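[retry 2/3] Syntenin-1: previous attempt timed out, resubmitting with same input.
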Amino acid sequence: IKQGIREVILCKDQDGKIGLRLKSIDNGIFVQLVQANSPASLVGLRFGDQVLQINGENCAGWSSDKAHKVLKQAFGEKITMTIRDRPFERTITMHKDSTGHVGFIFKNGKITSIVKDSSAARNGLLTEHNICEINGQNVIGLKDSQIADILSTSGTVVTITIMPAFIFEHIIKRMAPSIMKSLMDHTIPEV
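[retry 2/3] Syntenin-1: success.
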């Protein structure tokens, strides 16, 4: 999580899409979904990102509906966005033991207990937290089985981006759990 604000310049694809759904939270605007192979994915927009400005207009107090409308009407040659990096999330580094365990249990993406004497315990991992990312890889809507595989197939260093359940549940409302699975960018980013 980068310690401040950044500018991203976007250009609609040949269909007029940027590949982004936005959700009103606490009078801000947050990224609900980033489409794979969209302008939004290429410039590095992330689920949970805060959008402070679009074309140097303040987003404060906008409905989800208005934010989507503003994006529709943009002279898409170039769109400037001001972004606060994943303000509701935090990152935890843990180390697998001799058995390839970091030391927790999750269910529907949500960490549910921590295992006594684990790296997860030593690093103060919290329950009632949804897994958003693993080593930078968005994992939102994947089956539990696929998240395990990403942990299994990760280095011995595992980085996890977590979000308080209540907040996570408030962002993903009004988007079906098939779109999450299907359309949420789950790719390692390009260079």
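[retry 2/3] Syntenin-1: The longest helix spans residues 64-73.
[retry 2/3] clearing retry counter.
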